[PDB]
Amino acid sequence: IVGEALEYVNIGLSHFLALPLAQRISLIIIIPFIYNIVWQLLYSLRKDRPPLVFYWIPWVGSAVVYGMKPYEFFEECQKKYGDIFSFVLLGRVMTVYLGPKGHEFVFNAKLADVSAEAAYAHLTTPVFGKGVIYDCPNSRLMEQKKFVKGALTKEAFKSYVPLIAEEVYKYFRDSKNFRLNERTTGTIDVMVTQPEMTIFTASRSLLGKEMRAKLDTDFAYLYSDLDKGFTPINFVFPNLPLEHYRKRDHAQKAISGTYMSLIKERRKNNDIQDRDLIDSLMKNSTYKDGVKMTDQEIANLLIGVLMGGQHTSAAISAWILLHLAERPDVQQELYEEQMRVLDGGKKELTYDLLQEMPLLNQTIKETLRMHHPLHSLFRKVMKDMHVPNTSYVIPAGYHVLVSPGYTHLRDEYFPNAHQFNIHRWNNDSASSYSVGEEVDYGFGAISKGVSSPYLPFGGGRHRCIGEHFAYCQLGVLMSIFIRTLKWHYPEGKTVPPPDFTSMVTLPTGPAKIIWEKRNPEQKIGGRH
Ligand code: HEM
Ligand SMILES: OC(Cn1cncn1)(Cn1cncn1)c1ccc(F)cc1F
């Protein structure tokens, strides 16, 4: 008889509940540890699942090693398992597909298979505001991107270039980090200067003179507050009721309120031209179904676009300065190009002349290769996905992770990948180009194939639309840097390792360089 055994289950249960709370919590801690270990061993026996990276701590998973050094994590996993593997990340299962076929599998995934907004809305929506980017169906995002692109034309860039140039010179003249009329040499932290230069140039051109003017006041602190809400922390804790979450929410309201004030002021004055992105969205933000974006949604879209372009661009210009700091040969080569294209500096820089500066553009291109701002891009898996030429199935509820920035740094696709070499792009200085067929998801024709090992701007429906603005901004900025200054490292200093813990792969600061005026007695005009 096992009825007696059934009695002892009950008895055993009663004795369990009567254990000392020392052993009890000890069991509360050890019982999931064992189950988690057991479950993994069972999981590895499945062959319709990609290999899963082993981990000791339940829920946490490989979060530590991935959070701190994701490319080293990927390389070890790649050696062990190949290009497709999964790992647990703070409650989630992430399936990584490394390499060009991984680019295809994720970036060109069917709309019904994966969702970007399901992965990102929790973070971005509190920062940008409601109704836009990832707080809306994909079809709305497609048209929002179309609206923004309408202010990102060649004719717009022709107008932006002198505005951006003005801001760079103003910064050289007025910022305490330079003061070129008073000082001929100095030391700067590029992680201090580049965010400032980036927001000043982007505000002036995209938002206009009024909004740029606000950055000279205490209002600028709000952008810094809003900046704090844009952090990997908010992927896990999007809202816990403490301080920087409040200042974030406050900043969003305060900043969007300022934009709406200008929007409403321009319309009631009929003061709507073709100056900036605000004018453009005011004249062009009606969806195809006839629903118009509200002034709040327009304001929120402005925040998201400026914020995203802020962090990517500021990281890159910082990396460009840092790589050139130990390459006076490259500075010299870029300077000669400036002298030739701008006729010894007597030609005023224009958007057209920027396109005649291949080495400068190649420098941006090579920096984008070595320092892709976003080391990982996510999608939540919505339907079971079969991985082609495998028996692998990625079940709904998983997340897929694609990492073009990892491939950027592989010798197989870029010889001597860890060497900064702008000449690997000789006769290939364009920001990007489709090697064949195109397709339109609602914001213009783009590459249908996403198999390039070089994808600084992603691909597919979620592809970047700011690439030409970024090159314009970076180009003007670096053209002026090169013509005005020489710079180098403090003794014993070199290019710093990336900080993979922030939203973008910015350099580990403080990252200091020493600048010197090429023309010590050159003065920058204007009142101050
Ligand atoms: C060096 C500068 C930049 C780089 C490397 C970069 C990179 C990227 C990448 C990789 C994506 C794809 C994201 C994904 O697939 O989840 C993306 C998307 C996007 N970016 Fe950029 N970006 C840059 C600058 C900018 C600028 C200046 C703007 C706007 C003025 C901008 C606006 C956008 C927008 C609207 C998307 C669409 C996201 C989506 O559809 O889900 N970016 N960018
Ligand atoms: O793709 C981002 C969001 N993101 C994803 N991983 C980290 N941040 C970044 N970004 C890309 N280009 C510029 N910023 C984005 C996309 C659109 C957008 F409006 C804001 C925004 F942050």
DSSP per-residue codes, 393-433? EE-TT-EEEE-HHHHTT-TTTSSSTTS--GGGGTT--SS--
**CA-wise closest residue to 502 among 408, 369, 374, 405:** 374
CA of 37 to the centre of ligand 2 (A): 36
Mutate which of 399, 457, 478 to test ligand 1's pocket (most atoms within 8 Å of Cβ)? 457
- Ligand 1 in contact with 454 (CB < 6 A)? no
* Protein residue with least CA distance to atom 33, ligand 1: 464
**CA-wise closest residue to 498 among 350, 323, 362:** 323
Is residue 60 within 8 A of residue 93, CB to CB? The reply is no
Tell me the C-alpha distance between 161 and 156, whole Å: 9
Phi/psi for 441 (5° steps) reads -95, 0
DSSP letter, residue 203: I
Q: Residue 235 in 3-state DSSP?
A: helix
Q: Residue 363 in 3-state DSSP?
A: helix
Residue whose token pair is 């360089």: 513
- Ligand 1 in contact with 404 (CB < 6 A)? no
Who contacts 397 (Cβ-Cβ below 8 Å, separation ≥6)? 93, 380, 381
Phi/psi for 394 (5° steps) reads -100, 105
- Burial class (CB within 10 angstroms; exposed 0-12, middle 13-18, buried 19+) of 495: middle
Planar angle of CA 525, 324, 425, nearest 5 degrees: 110
Tell me the C-alpha distance between 396 and 459, whole Å: 22
Looking at ligand 1, which atom is closest to the CA of residue 456?
5
Q: Residue 401 in 3-state DSSP?
A: strand
Is residue 505 within 8 A of residue 372, CB to CB? The reply is yes
Planar angle of CA 515, 478, 273, nearest 5 degrees: 130
Q: Is 379 annotated as a binding residue?
A: yes
What count of other Cβ atoms lies within 10 Å of the Cβ of residue 34? Answer: 11
Tell me the C-alpha distance between 414 and 418, whole Å: 9
Q: Is 134 annotated as a binding residue?
A: yes
Q: How far is CA 332 from CA 280, 326, 327, 486, 522, in A?
A: 40, 12, 9, 9, 19
73: left (phi over 0), alpha (psi -120 to 50) or beta: alpha
- Resolution of this deposited model, Å: 2.0
DSSP 431-495: S---SS-EEESSS-EEES----S--TT--GGG--S-HHHHHHHHHHHHHHHHHHEEEEPPTT--P
In the structure, which protein residues have their CB atom closer than 6 angstroms to any atom of ligand 2? 133, 304-305, 307-309, 312, 374, 464, 466, 503
CA of 308 to the centre of ligand 2 (A): 5
CA dihedral over 424, 426, 432, 435, signed as positive or negative: negative
Query: Exposed e or buried b for every residue in 156-186, given b needs 16+ CB within 10 A?
Result: bbeebbebbbbbbbbbbbbbebbebbeeeeb
What count of other Cβ atoms lies within 10 Å of the Cβ of residue 334? Answer: 22
Counting Cα atoms < 13 Å in the Cβ hemisphere of 420 gives: 20
Tell me the C-alpha distance between 192 and 172, whole Å: 14
**CA-wise closest residue to 280 among 200, 201, 205, 198:** 205
**CA-wise closest residue to 498 among 509, 490, 488:** 509
- Burial class (CB within 10 angstroms; exposed 0-12, middle 13-18, buried 19+) of 236: middle
**CA-wise closest residue to 507 among 373, 339, 335:** 373
Q: List the alpha helices (DSSP H) in 175-242.
A: 190-202, 209-214, 220-229, 233-236
Is residue 168 within 8 A of residue 480, CB to CB? The reply is yes
Tokens coding 416: 């001597």
What count of other Cβ atoms lies within 10 Å of the Cβ of residue 63? Answer: 18
Cα separation of the two ends of the chain: 97
Q: How far is CA 25 from CA 14, 56, 148, in A?
A: 16, 18, 55
DSSP letter, residue 423: G
Tokens coding 430: 């364009």
Tell me the C-alpha distance between 494 and 326, whole Å: 7
- Ligand 1 in contact with 302 (CB < 6 A)? no
Is residue 459 within 8 A of residue 450, CB to CB? The reply is yes
Residue whose token pair is 């090697």: 435
* Protein residue with least CA distance to atom 16, ligand 2: 308
What method did the depositors use to determine the structure?
A: X-ray
Strand partners, 393: 386
Tell me the C-alpha distance between 397 and 104, whole Å: 20
Would you call the peptide bond into 195 cis, given omega within 30 degrees of 0 as the criterion? Answer: no
Q: Which ligand is nearest to the CA of 314?
A: 1
Domains of the chain: 120-517 (1.10.630.10)
Q: Is 145 annotated as a binding residue?
A: yes
User: Do β-strands 512-517 and 185-189 pair in parallel, antiparallel, or remain unpaired?
Assistant: antiparallel
Who contacts 304 (Cβ-Cβ below 8 Å, separation ≥6)? 124, 127, 128, 129, 132, 133
CA of 308 to the centre of ligand 1 (A): 7
Is residue 103 within 8 A of residue 459, CB to CB? The reply is yes
CA of 441 to the centre of ligand 1 (A): 15
DSSP letter, residue 419: S
Counting Cα atoms < 13 Å in the Cβ hemisphere of 9 gives: 5
Tell me the C-alpha distance between 88 and 161, whole Å: 46
**CA-wise closest residue to 471 among 458, 456, 486:** 456
CA of 231 to the centre of ligand 2 (A): 12
**CA-wise closest residue to 460 among 103, 124, 32:** 103
